[PDB]
Amino acid sequence: FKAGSAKKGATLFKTRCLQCHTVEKGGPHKVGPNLHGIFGRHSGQAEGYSYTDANIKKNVLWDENNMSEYLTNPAKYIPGCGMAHGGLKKEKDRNDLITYLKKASE
């Protein structure tokens, strides 16, 4: 991961992520947990959300690289429903996204 465009990352997040996740402090859970302070904690630890994926639940320490990898696969499992478009296949898109996400969060 190498910093990119926050501005474009914002538009990736609004159009690809926001329909399941919010990022502002104290923001609400949706199908996905609120992501505020995601880069200061581990996986599967948002207050007031209960997780499903075994790997998330192991509490991975989130960093840029781990997250890029998490977002690489275009499809993700949504509990009780099936697979959904939960990632960004283009490495540049990931870098943009994560650059925005680091700022919007914390």
Q: What residue type is assigned to position 49 of the chain?
A: Y
> Longest Cα pair distance anywhere in the chain, in angstroms?
35
Interface pattern 42-81 for a second copy (x via CB under 8 A): ------xxxxx-------------------------xxxx
Residue with tokens 């320490």, as numbered in its chain? 61
CA-closest candidate to residue 98, choices 69, 74, 68: 68
State the binding partner of 56 from a second copy, ligand HEM, none, CB within 5 to 8 A by kind: ligand HEM
Nearer to ligand HEM, 2 or 48 (CB): 48
Residue from 25, 30, 58, 92 in contact with a second copy (CB under 8 A): 30
Q: Which helix (H) or strand (E) holds 30?
A: none
**Is residue 41 at the binding interface for a second copy, with CB under 8 A as the rule?**
no
Q: Kind of pairing, strands 75-78 and 82-85?
A: antiparallel
Distance CA 56, CA 93 (A): 22
* Interacting residues toward ligand HEM by CB under 6 A: 16-17, 20-21, 31-33, 35, 38, 43-44, 46, 51-53, 56, 71, 78-81, 84-88
Which residues does the annotation place in the binding site for heme c?
Answer: 17, 20-21, 83
